[PDB]
């Protein structure tokens, strides 16, 4: 109930409940099925681009959602959501397979837990990537691909799925960048390796962008 | 009362009281209202500016205040204020929406808690931003807008109070900067997204500056 | 077995068992044999190569395995593997002898523990090294050698061993790199110092690579 | 007693006593008087001087002393002093008001606690400052002022005091630096803001320095 | 007993014993004498030198030993040594007095404790220093001196002693520089402000650029 959002004792009790039930290191699989993790990158800035080394330096908001129904509660007379330090929650062990620098989180490491068990997590991340920068100076642009998946959980445990397939992130991308976004595509993809018998799901984010004229 | 400020045992007891009552992870909402957080930036320096990439590197003191009256105490015969490590307190989850680097905090991470429950927190922060640098070499200067608000709390939980005086800006800005500040103004705005209907309040700080 | 992989309570119980049994600071010697640690570097990116200083800056996935049978469980009707934060596990104290920067871990610090007690750990690491960079711009390329072993455990305690002797690394290396790999060889190597009595059993990784034409 | 300095059990017991008594988060005010903190910067090196941005990058040892008589013990037959991790102690919340980088501490974060309750703390700090760099290439040199006080305690709570106003720092400054120090002056200074009531004390450190071999062909 | 080195329970038990006895924050002064700390720097690389600013950036293995007999155990039928996280141990508060950057430790922070109570600690450290780089491009080379001693313990509490080489087993063959000589000598430091003497090791790194181009 929105009207109870500012009831501090309710918020405290919800946080307590969440911390009692939460298993931060155990995947929250329900009904013996993979955890469905929804991922969408919203690019904010393209800071540096190197056509020689095929590297980009970018900032994006990583819109991330999943469900853990064990966290649910009846919010008929209490806040429908609270903010929770992610140290109290399981968070998917996502990583970009072509990152060449640490993900630098620029934002408070908090998630929102919804009373129906949904968890919303959106770090702003600055990170560098190895990807195809060729054509950045042309009108058709470069198409830089970023692959994001679970670092240790295979497809039977975690499914990593794109939320939206297409956008030019108009609400998000800085108008002040020297680059402009032509199109952002996000599709599912499965990866396997000769060493290991299982498949790993990821989202392939295709960033089509060019230098402004 | 100020006469009792240096009573050490009193200070220790106040710190104990604050730590027993404090909920560092819960917003301190009082009487069915959002936490009103006052935020004003006092710019100290402009260090690097890039008109090609539209990026600025600045240092500011982030004046931050809010109330948590559950922290209040009777100070008739005890200190009026104490310093408290912010790890012992709830602090607003503010973030700069157009920051392109982590906020580098240059100062001890302590706040003051006043006996009426007011909390004062003022980190000196160095941070880089993406903003409009065009006009920095002209006499009308550039206007770089920095937007700061809660990262996870919407308007019914945290409201931002942007109201501040700016006639004292020269007490703060370094005389040895390569840049000069012409004007600083702040206004409230609201931020919403297609995906997400709740409104998030922010303060837009318009920094109007130019190369000396 | 895989049909019980998503039994959350089972996973939680296995994580509990591992944490009860694990001794993170004690080498998992079994019988009276050294711990056999298998190491293979899968190169992802060669980012900087410095002609003059003989330095390279690389990203690699450090495939690392060893066994601790005390961690084993019956997975007839339970998950075959779980992810475990490495803070809960003993991990080999590996270091590159010719590293000239800290290993920067780019990925979640989790390992897999298998029900037969095998541990699988593979951080993505960015690190700089001092090695022979001569020939990088030639057909035959440069051969940069990286020596990896236990920092404090000698050969009676830990053996650091190669998995495969040669690798094409084609499933791993970035196709957008400005370099390409001719061969990666990884061989056993023993090191002694005149100051000190014991031998240290390490893996010598020879990265034969060149700038793309 | 100097003869008992190396009695390990005594040192352990002193460290235990200190940890039992210490309130790391509470100012050690005595007699309703402000804590007197003595600060003296001994410059070790001037790493970089940017004439375009008016910035210096320096290394200094921050000689810091104060007392907490609650920590005192009878050293008639026990060590005079011990080293203590500063995480076990209250330490003044000092900040440089014109710093433009974090203070990077190059030394183990230990203090000495003396049996009379004196605390001695001296980190080696590398840090960047915004200050007047003009004149660095002249004979009279540049004068870069660094202002250091408590970040959150006003003058009734902490007073910050220079140990000594004038030195050339001969025992400390590297002979291999590109620069040379003419004089370091450190004076008391009081800071107030029209926004806020009380006064904050600080030490104003004026670093008078110049480039070696300022005279060039071209 | 080396035959028992890999007895896991024995190792776990030794680790337990060490952690029960260890006082990580108290100097292990035995018999009212200062702790004798042995230090030898084995240089691995010289990464950058600047003859204008007189600064060097180097990597070295800091061979460090001292003893704490209270840690000693009977190894007749148990391991001779175990590795121990240094967070469980007292370690000397060493610092380089002319360092101009933080010591960057490149290696797992473990020490070996020997059953006679000897502790061996050897971090690989990357660090920058202010020292004399003049002469680096010449035959004679430069001689960069690095002073390392206790940051807070004077000579009555800690003595820091050198254990004379060109570091051939350690220095990188692929460095741009080459080492002519490394000497390490005892040294004593005092200040006007302060009575006590502080012991340090003064390390002299005599090195030069490889394959110089000179005017003959
Ligand atoms: N565009 C957007 N997307 C998501 C989101 C998240 C998952 S799917 C979609 C969440 C979100 N906000 C709520 C939120 C929840 C959790 C963490 C951070 N923020 C609003 C908002 C406004 C301004 C600064 C930051 N956030 N905003
Ligand atoms: N200009 C200014 N603004 C605020 C403030 C805070 C919120 S609204 C306004 C507080 C403040 N001081 C008290 C204080 C409280 C908390 C943290 C840090 N400082 C005095 C002062 C003096 C010199 C260095 C630093 N501070 N000074
Ligand atoms: N190529 C590959 N090798 C190993 C491996 C490990 C030891 S020997 C061989 C493990 C592994 N995965 C499982 C795993 C377990 C532990 C840590 C990290 N990853 C799948 C995978 C897929 C894509 C990104 C990362 N991981 N993938
Ligand atoms: N020059 C100097 N000044 C002070 C000092 C301190 C406060 S007022 C004056 C203390 C001090 N030493 C003792 C000490 C105590 C605490 C922390 C660090 N060191 C000797 C010394 C020698 C060489 C390296 C480091 N220290 N040396
Ligand atoms: N050359 C050398 N010196 C010492 C040493 C130490 C004190 S006096 C002499 C110790 C040592 N090793 C044992 C050891 C113990 C503690 C920490 C690290 N290493 C072998 C070794 C081999 C290769 C990489 C690393 N270590 N190696
Ligand atoms: C939640 O509580 C309300 C009573 O306030 C009740 O009407 C409703 O059925 C409850 N929901 C569930 C799922 O039990
Ligand atoms: C506070 O304490 C004083 C004396 O200790 C008393 O006079 C007063 O009534 C108390 N309450 C308030 C609100 O001042
Ligand atoms: C493993 O298999 C089943 C588990 O259901 C059980 O009968 C048996 O005791 C287990 N243990 C071993 C050693 O096989
Ligand atoms: C300290 O203790 C000694 C005995 O060990 C005694 O002679 C002396 O009077 C004591 N001093 C104080 C100040 O208590
Ligand atoms: C050590 O233990 C052995 C038995 O394990 C015993 O014979 C011996 O007396 C003990 N003491 C020494 C100093 O070896």
Structure tokens at B29: 């909402």
Contact assessment for residue C135 and residue C142, using Cβ atoms and an 8 Å cutoff: yes
Task: Measure the CA–CA gap between A23 and A21, rounded to whole angstroms.
Answer: 7
D60 Cα to the center of ligand 4, angstroms: 12
Residue E162 to residues A75, E105, E128, Cα–Cα distance (Å): 69, 21, 21
| Closest of E57, E36, E63, E6 to residue E184, by C-alpha | E63
| 3-state per-residue secondary structure call for chain A | CHHHCCCHHHHHHHHHHHHHHCCCCCCCCCCCCCEEEEEEEEEEEEEEEECCCCEEEEEEEEEEEEECHHHCCCCCCCCCEEEEEHHHCCCCCEEECCECCCCEECCCCEEEEECCCEEEECCEEEEEEECCCCCCCCCCCEEEEEEEEECCCCCCCEEEEECCCEECCCCCCCCCCCEEEEEEEEEEEEEEECCEEEEEEEEEEEEEEEECC
Task: Measure the CA–CA gap between A29 and A37, rounded to whole angstroms.
Answer: 11
CA C35 to chain centre: 14
Q: Is A197 on the interface with C (CB under 8 A)?
A: no
Closest B-chain CA to D132: B176
Chain D residues close to B64, C-beta within 8 Å:
none
- Touching, C vs A (3+ Cβ pairs under 8 A): yes
Q: Which residues pair with C158 in a beta bridge?
A: C35
- Which residues have C-beta within 8 Å of that of residue D134, sequence separation ≥ 6? D51, D54, D142
Around C131, how many Cα atoms within 13 Å sit in the side-chain half-sphere?
26
Q: Is the CB of D77 under 6 A from ligand 9?
A: yes
C198 Cα to the center of ligand 5, angstroms: 10
Q: How many CB atoms lie within 10 A of CB D48?
A: 13
Q: Is the CB of B194 under 6 A from ligand 7?
A: no
Pairing of strands B158-161, B35-50: parallel
Q: Is the CB of C77 under 6 A from ligand 8?
A: yes
Identify the residue whose tokens are 């250091």.
D148
CA angle in degrees (0–180, nearest 5) for C152-C154-C155: 150
Task: Measure the CA–CA gap between D112 and D120, rounded to whole angstroms.
Answer: 5
Q: Is B9 on the interface with A (CB under 8 A)?
A: no
- Touching, D vs C (3+ Cβ pairs under 8 A): no
Identify the residue whose tokens are 């609650």.
D70
Closest ligand to C-alpha of residue A77 is 6
CA C23 to chain centre: 20
Overall resolution, Å: 2.0
Q: Is the CB of D196 under 6 A from ligand 2?
A: yes
Q: Is D152 within 8 Å of B108 when comparing Cβ atoms?
A: yes
Q: How many CB atoms lie within 10 A of CB D8?
A: 19
Q: Is E112 within 8 Å of C23 when comparing Cβ atoms?
A: no
Contact assessment for residue C80 and residue A133, using Cβ atoms and an 8 Å cutoff: no
Task: Measure the CA–CA gap between B167 and B170, rounded to whole angstroms.
Answer: 8
Residue A115, φ and ψ in degrees, nearest 5 = -65, -10
| 3-state per-residue secondary structure call for C20-38 | HHCCCCCCCCECCECEEEE
Query: What is the nearest CA distance from B77 to chain A, expressed in angstroms?
Result: 30
Q: Which residues pair with C207 in a beta bridge?
A: C144, C184
Task: Measure the CA–CA gap between A127 and C106, rounded to whole angstroms.
Answer: 10
Task: Measure the CA–CA gap between A141 and A134, rounded to whole angstroms.
Answer: 8
How deeply is C1 buried, as exposed, middle or buried, from its count of CB atoms within 10 A (0-12, 13-18, 19+)?
A: exposed
Map out the domains of chain C with their CATH numbers: 1-213 (2.70.170.10)
CA E174 to chain centre: 23
Chain E residues close to D45, C-beta within 8 Å:
100, 130
Structure tokens at B53: 């990439």
Biggest CA–CA distance in chain E, Å, is: 67
Identify the residue whose tokens are 């700089």.
C128
Around A119, how many Cα atoms within 13 Å sit in the side-chain half-sphere?
25
C164 Cα to the center of ligand 8, angstroms: 34
E strand or H helix that includes residue E10: helix E8-21
Contact assessment for residue A98 and residue A128, using Cβ atoms and an 8 Å cutoff: no
Question: What letter does residue E23 receive in the DSSP assignment?
Answer: -
CA A25 to chain centre: 18
A16 Cα to the center of ligand 6, angstroms: 20
| Closest of C146, C174, C151 to residue C162, by C-alpha | C146
Q: What are the DSSP calls for C49-108, one per residue?
A: EETTTTEEEEEEEEEEEEE-GGG----TTS-SEEEEEGGGS----EEETTB-S--EE-S-
Helix (H, G, I), strand (E, B) or coil at C169: coil
Residue A192 to residues A27, C79, C172, C184, Cα–Cα distance (Å): 21, 20, 11, 21
Structure tokens at B191: 């931020």
Q: How many CB atoms lie within 10 A of CB D213?
A: 8
Task: Measure the CA–CA gap between E6 and E8, rounded to whole angstroms.
Answer: 6
Pairing of strands B35-50, B55-67: antiparallel
Identify the residue whose tokens are 């000069």.
B180
Task: Measure the CA–CA gap between A156 and A4, rounded to whole angstroms.
Answer: 39
Task: Measure the CA–CA gap between E70 and E24, rounded to whole angstroms.
Answer: 12
- What are the b/e assignments for B141-161, b being 16+ CB within 10 Å? bbbbbbbbbbbbbbbbbbbbb
Task: Measure the CA–CA gap between C211 and C133, rounded to whole angstroms.
Answer: 11
Q: Is the CB of A115 under 6 A from ligand 6?
A: no
Q: Which of E86, E122, E163, E184 to mutate to test the pocket of ligand 5 (most atoms within 8 A of CB)?
A: E122
Residue C50, φ and ψ in degrees, nearest 5 = -115, 110
Q: Is B19 on the interface with A (CB under 8 A)?
A: no
Helix (H, G, I), strand (E, B) or coil at B193: strand
Structure tokens at D87: 């995480």
Binding partners of E (≥3 Cβ pairs within 8 A): C, D
CA angle in degrees (0–180, nearest 5) for A131-A133-A136: 155
């Amino acid at each position: 109930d929105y009207k109870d959002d500012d009831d501090k004792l309710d918020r405290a009790d919800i946080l307590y409940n969440i911390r009692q039930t939460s298993r931060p290191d155990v995947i929250p699989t329900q009904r013996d099925r993979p955890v469905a993790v929804s991922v969408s990158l919203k690019f904010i800035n393209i800071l540096e681009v190197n056509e020689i080394t095929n590297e980009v330096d970018v900032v994006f908001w990583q819109q991330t959602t999943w469900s853990d129904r064990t966290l649910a509660w009846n919010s008929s007379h209490s806040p429908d959501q609270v903010s929770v330090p992610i140290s109290s929650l399981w968070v998917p062990d996502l990583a970009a397979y072509n990152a060449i620098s640490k993900p630098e989180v620029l934002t408070p490491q908090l998630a929102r837990v919804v009373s129906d068990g949904e968890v919303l997590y959106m770090p702003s991340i600055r990170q560098r990537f190895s990807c195809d920068v060729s054509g950045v100076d042309t009108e058709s642009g470069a198409t830089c691909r970023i692959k994001i998946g679970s670092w240790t959980h295979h497809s039977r445990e975690i499914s990593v799925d794109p939320t939206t397939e297409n956008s030019d992130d108009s609400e998000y991308f800085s108008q002040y960048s020297r680059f402009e976004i032509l199109d952002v595509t996000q599709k599912k993809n499965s990866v396997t390796y000769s060493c290991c018998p299982e498949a790993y799901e990821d989202v392939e984010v295709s960033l089509n962008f060019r230098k402004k004229g």
